[PDB]
């Protein structure tokens, strides 16, 4: 069912995209 | 069904693009 729904693709996509976001961290309190 | 579509290419080849896609945020704000 995750696979054939796209659910694992979604489950692993948003996963890196906080990571991603993790670098956020550096301009927010530096600007 | 995913290998002989290309599924699990658009699968994989939409992933990273995000991943490339991340490194937008750096030049959004500092710009």
Redesign the interface.
């Known amino acids: 069912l995750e ?1 054939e729904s ?1 659910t694992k ?1 979604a489950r ?2 948003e996963k ?2 906080a990571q ?2 993790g ?2 961290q550096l ?1 927010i309190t530096k ?1």
Do not use: I, V, Y
Request: proline letters at 0%; zero cysteines; glycine letters at 8%.
């Open positions: 696979q796209g693709h692993d996509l890196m995209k991603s976001q670098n956020q301009e600007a």
